[PDB]
Amino acid sequence: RAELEELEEFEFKHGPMSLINDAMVTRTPVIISLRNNHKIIARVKAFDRHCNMVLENVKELWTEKKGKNVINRERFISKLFLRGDSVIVVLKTP
Amino acid sequence: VSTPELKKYMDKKILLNINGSRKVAGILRGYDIFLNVVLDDAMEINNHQLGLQTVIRGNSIISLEALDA
Amino acid sequence: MVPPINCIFNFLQQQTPVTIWLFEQIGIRIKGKIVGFDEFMNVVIDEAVEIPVNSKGTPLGKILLKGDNITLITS
Amino acid sequence: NGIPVKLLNEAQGHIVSLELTTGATYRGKLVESEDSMNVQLRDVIATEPQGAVTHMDQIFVRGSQIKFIVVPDLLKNAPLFK
Amino acid sequence: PVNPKPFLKGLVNHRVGVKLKFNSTEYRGTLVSTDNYFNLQLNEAEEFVAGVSHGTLGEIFIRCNNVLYIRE
Amino acid sequence: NTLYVSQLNEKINMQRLRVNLFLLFATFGEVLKVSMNFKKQRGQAFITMRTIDQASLAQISLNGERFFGKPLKVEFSKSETKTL
Amino acid sequence: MVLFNIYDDWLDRISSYTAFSRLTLLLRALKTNEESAKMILLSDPTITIKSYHLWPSFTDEQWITIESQMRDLILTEYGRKYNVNISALTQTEIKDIILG
Amino acid sequence: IQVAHSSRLANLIDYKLRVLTQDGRVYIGQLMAFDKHMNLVLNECIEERVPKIKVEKRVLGLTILRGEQILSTVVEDKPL
Amino acid sequence: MKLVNFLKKLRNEQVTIELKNGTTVWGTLQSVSPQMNAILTDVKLTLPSDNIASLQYINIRGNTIRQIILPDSLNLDSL
Amino acid sequence: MKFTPSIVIDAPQYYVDHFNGKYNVDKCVILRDLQLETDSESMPSSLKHLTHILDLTNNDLIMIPDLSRRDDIHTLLLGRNNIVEVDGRLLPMNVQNLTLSNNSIRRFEDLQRLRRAPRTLKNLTLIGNQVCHLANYREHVLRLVPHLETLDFQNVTAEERKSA
RNA sequence: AUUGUUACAAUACACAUUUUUUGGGGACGGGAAGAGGAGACGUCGCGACCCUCGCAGAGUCGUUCUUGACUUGGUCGCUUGAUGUUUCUUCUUCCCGUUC
């Protein structure tokens, strides 16, 4: 009961989410992508098992125009709680 | 857990309707709880053959009208 | 009758030819031979080749395809 | 257990319509039911959004892709709830 | 004989090539590790958007649901 | 309470007919019945009201009233309605 | 005993006194309201904190802007607190900044 | 539109709710039953369509809706 | 253990949400559950920039919720 | 008494008219025999709650008053009233099913508000009045109010239209 | 002059295919006329020379002043009615409403 769930806590630091964990520990920026042609930038704070993260300094970048002329919109958000399904790829910049 | 009633449709040709416009067809050999239909025939669509046997996945399998009622 | 669990085993035993189908792209279809056995739908496919079928030779090694992505398999 | 499932089970041998993800409207009898909504039909008409209608003899539907399964006005109050 | 998980394990500390369905971008880099849910962790990542590279990422991570296949 | 109509235009549609009936009967009192139960058409419609007085009034006033060409034959129902 | 250069990359660009002043401004702001200060610091996530720095490495103009923001925060918070009518001059606000 | 401060789905049973699909086809019906996946039994489903300007209407079934494609339910008006 | 725990702890906060459609909706969470089943008290809406077409009472499924915007900026999940 | 907000509030908005839509309001203690002598004032108290079916029959309403959006009062019943003239720009698209039976519409020129109906009134019926007895009245109606589908229970045919 | 037993739900686990974690004076509107939108597939309506002719979700029975069990609008016009797939390629004049 306890040991089954408790053993899975250390699995984050060993596997694929190790990097994420590290980032969370030592606050640094990370480019988070999305399904509908979106690109978010933020520094992590908390973390979870199924990639249900929460970050600060949320700089969003997404298009809302036709194929002929692009338009890079911007908006400064913070303290969001994004779902793990939409999160495609993350990376800790130096 | 609860097994679907595929015993009634066993040993009979069925015109399948897969996801994303694909009218496949073949006789049902085996079945399971996850809906991975082990069929023993395949023919795309006009008509043209492409391999005899074909074990399809459970997700991509919406419609399946039986030829012989 | 032939079940999905034993099917995998059979495939492993034999190492026969296969033509995998994709979900998103209709034209681009994989071609190779299955190898690995597992509980989920995901299994190793040796000597992969993504051919562009009609409504032609993609470069790739031993493709370990995903469980959800696979649309078809012949054996 | 699920109430909807129970209701479905109860309605066995009745004219139940359907609606898929793509939008293929059906209308026929109910063969059987289960925990997972695996519906089977008999004398099932096909009036799809594509236009080209048809009249199918039999058809088995997947529960995941189904949007909503229709049901008659008889089984409203009793004898499913209490 | 050679299973999928085993293969994956073998491939750790070696070059890997993953491609996603939605927005097809070939991610090229050295594989670090993997879990039971089939999550990816790459090093020296190069997001090849249909051949042409966007930019050299470095260290990176990838979800299980997006990816299609894994190759050399 | 209920008032069984007869001798009306069958050529008109069902829902429309019902609507018309509702419109007609709102002057006398509150019409309880929303839709027709028989589904046969050609006059046979049971206008269910809240009050009996209202129903009576309707019977009195709309006896042989011009509705879609023909004169409607108003009359009191034999059995009581399922809703009432 | 741990060692930290609190002037993470300021001494080469600006003088020592200036650096000290900046630190004071930051620290005071943090004290007043920490979350706000943090937000101010990390407005642009591209301006990242280094592996051996306590603060984000801004350009000179950027730094100035940040300082200004901090000052504003300090003022605003003060106003909220003590219901003062208005700051008379910049030299009156110096006292507020330094001493408290 | 009348709507009190409801706590949960159990308290708001037997009420006329508008349901939104994944594709964006608006519905409307009385919520009869509840479930684990939120398969709400509609008393009489009046479906509506909007082309990819103006909303259409229909009246096919009194269906038991599925939980996968459902976006969010919204109360229209109380009964009785 | 889970990130949903944190969500559950919060209540009566005017939190926005970037849904699958794209329209914002800033309202009270009310009774948040295990499967992210939020219940809006009062929020904005833009039916398919964002136009003005809001509704008062509402109830949302957790599958649709792609994000939960901030109301009270505070980090305290464990307890 | 006069149609106030309090009266509206009091009114029974529980039993919905199940033929179409919801909330069949009946203003005051009962709209049927409310005796609203003046025009329908304080319409804002309802605030477009709901076809709506605001059954304001058996009243003494001099003129038909509306104040709401395009979907607020489709099946309005104003039977047995003293409706002299019903000109207005508020209820443009909504009021389709107009039950104006036993009204006091005397002349054909009194229906000029409803007439020029291409933009003035998107839909309107009107029947069972003094103007119905006048010579060539139906024809006139057809000419002016083309949107009037059902003219006193009988439909406006193509032949009729041609004639007018 | 409450305690005991039994049954069913809620709370306590919950990333792999049937489900909550991945298949994205000038503008505007309507109607009519003139000059250089159209064809299929269905799905509901306005008229009728037509059909059809009546009182009851329907029928049967047990028991008692109202309840338990067992069975299973069709056709033709539209003489310019509405509406979703699916292929191809506007200007002038008058009348009526809204806005400045």
mmCIF file of C-alpha atoms in Angstrom, chain I residues 16-51:
data_model
loop_
_atom_site.group_PDB
_atom_site.id
_atom_site.type_symbol
_atom_site.label_atom_id
_atom_site.label_comp_id
_atom_site.label_asym_id
_atom_site.label_seq_id
_atom_site.Cartn_x
_atom_site.Cartn_y
_atom_site.Cartn_z
ATOM 1 C CA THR I 16 -8.949 31.858 -15.393
ATOM 2 C CA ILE I 17 -8.566 28.844 -17.718
ATOM 3 C CA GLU I 18 -7.276 28.306 -21.276
ATOM 4 C CA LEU I 19 -9.677 25.607 -22.538
ATOM 5 C CA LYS I 20 -9.550 23.570 -25.781
ATOM 6 C CA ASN I 21 -11.715 26.194 -27.551
ATOM 7 C CA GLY I 22 -9.441 29.091 -26.484
ATOM 8 C CA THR I 23 -11.945 31.329 -24.648
ATOM 9 C CA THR I 24 -11.093 32.556 -21.131
ATOM 10 C CA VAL I 25 -13.297 31.971 -18.065
ATOM 11 C CA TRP I 26 -12.327 33.637 -14.753
ATOM 12 C CA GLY I 27 -14.608 32.484 -11.903
ATOM 13 C CA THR I 28 -14.797 30.766 -8.506
ATOM 14 C CA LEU I 29 -13.635 27.130 -8.291
ATOM 15 C CA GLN I 30 -16.187 26.100 -5.614
ATOM 16 C CA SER I 31 -16.080 22.263 -5.223
ATOM 17 C CA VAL I 32 -12.870 21.035 -6.886
ATOM 18 C CA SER I 33 -12.490 17.229 -7.044
ATOM 19 C CA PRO I 34 -9.965 14.395 -7.783
ATOM 20 C CA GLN I 35 -10.712 14.357 -11.546
ATOM 21 C CA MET I 36 -10.440 18.186 -11.953
ATOM 22 C CA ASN I 37 -14.244 18.689 -12.040
ATOM 23 C CA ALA I 38 -14.470 22.477 -11.554
ATOM 24 C CA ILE I 39 -17.720 24.437 -11.044
ATOM 25 C CA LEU I 40 -17.778 28.100 -12.150
ATOM 26 C CA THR I 41 -19.706 30.692 -10.095
ATOM 27 C CA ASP I 42 -19.412 33.640 -12.517
ATOM 28 C CA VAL I 43 -17.042 34.082 -15.492
ATOM 29 C CA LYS I 44 -16.547 35.534 -18.984
ATOM 30 C CA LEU I 45 -16.930 33.665 -22.290
ATOM 31 C CA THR I 46 -16.346 33.995 -26.059
ATOM 32 C CA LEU I 47 -18.236 31.517 -28.288
ATOM 33 C CA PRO I 48 -16.805 29.965 -31.517
ATOM 34 C CA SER I 49 -9.417 38.025 -29.563
ATOM 35 C CA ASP I 50 -12.403 36.912 -27.445
ATOM 36 C CA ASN I 51 -15.906 38.438 -27.725
#
